[PDB]
Amino acid sequence: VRLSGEARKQVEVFRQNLFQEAEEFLYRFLPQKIIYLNQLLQEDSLNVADLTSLRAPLDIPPKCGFLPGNEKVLSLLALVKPEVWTLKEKCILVITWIQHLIPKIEDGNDFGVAIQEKVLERVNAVKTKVEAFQTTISKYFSERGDAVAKASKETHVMDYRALVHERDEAAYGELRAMVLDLRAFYAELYHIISSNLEKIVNPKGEEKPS
């Protein structure tokens, strides 16, 4: 097509800038972000064994007392949720960094192509699990909206209105498993990329005596 002299050079500078920006991420920050969530999971807040006091007991006898959210779980996601969304932002640039290294398209010498495809496939697989958590993160907050409202509305059944507290113990047990995989996401994607850094950054022979 028609390639503008100024417009193309603006991208070529940004092609190298976003390429060097991910190198700073792939080298310094990934080994650091692996051990940050480790100290986050080793926090005794997520490691509490007894879930009886971890729930949010509702006072259900309308002037019935105001029922707030769970400040324990909300404080846990206050640390976890920004790291879940930040991880996805880090992977998108890696997806761009992988798609920026797509070699010149040819029929042969696809060995460097298959390496990048398998890595990009596993990054997209982890990215799917991250946004799947982000759905369940926002879903449980919608679960609390229907559970607390229906429990406070029905005063005849004295059991199920107490049984909605089991979702509080459910979210805590699932959160600890979600933050457990959240830590592995940096570790798994690092081992995949770092070990294969040989031909990923250079998926070309470019030795052709012909």
């Binding site: 040819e106 029929d107 042969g108 022979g205 030795e207 005596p209």
Partner: protein, 234 residues
Amino acid sequence: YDRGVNTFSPEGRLFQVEYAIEAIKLGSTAIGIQTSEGVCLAVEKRITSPLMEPSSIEKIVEIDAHIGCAMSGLIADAKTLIDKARVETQNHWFTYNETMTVESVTQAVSNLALQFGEEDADPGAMSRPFGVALLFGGVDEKGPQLFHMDPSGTFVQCDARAIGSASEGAQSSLQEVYHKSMTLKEAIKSSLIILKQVMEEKLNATNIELATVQPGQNFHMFTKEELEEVIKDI
């Protein structure tokens, strides 16, 4: 496996031969040198264990008094080619009563390399190309001559050509250091500097082998005397 040896690619390349030149990137780094005063060839032995004797393994052998050799990649593929190369070299003197020129040496090797084939031939024919990168130097009445050969089978007169794993950055480095009339001793200097830099192991008399050819001095294999001198005279 779902492909042939002679099958052409949509880009006009051979599947077989392309991987040949692709296979030689795992060989040992070696560099040839052509000087106004003679020809110089060096090769890395690449010994994988002290029990393995570096003296028995020889990647530079003497065909004629003028012509040396070089080896990379699979060693036995070169030995197969050098055997017939030494036969036709003496077949030259057996007829014309003279030493074979460096050009006629590669012409015989280029013919043996081009014969590669499978069907419509005898079982005594080589089916697949060699993973060796060849460097044939020598000095005759025409003067010093150094030729380069790859699995394709071509031979071209060149001052210096790098082979092996480091041939990528070495060949560009040999261009920079070597120029004009630079002689033997000055060539060994820049040779051992570039080789020691690219290889993992440090320079030693037993880790590499070096030999030169001169107009007045025929092919001379450097013993522990000459090898230990040039490594400390670098």
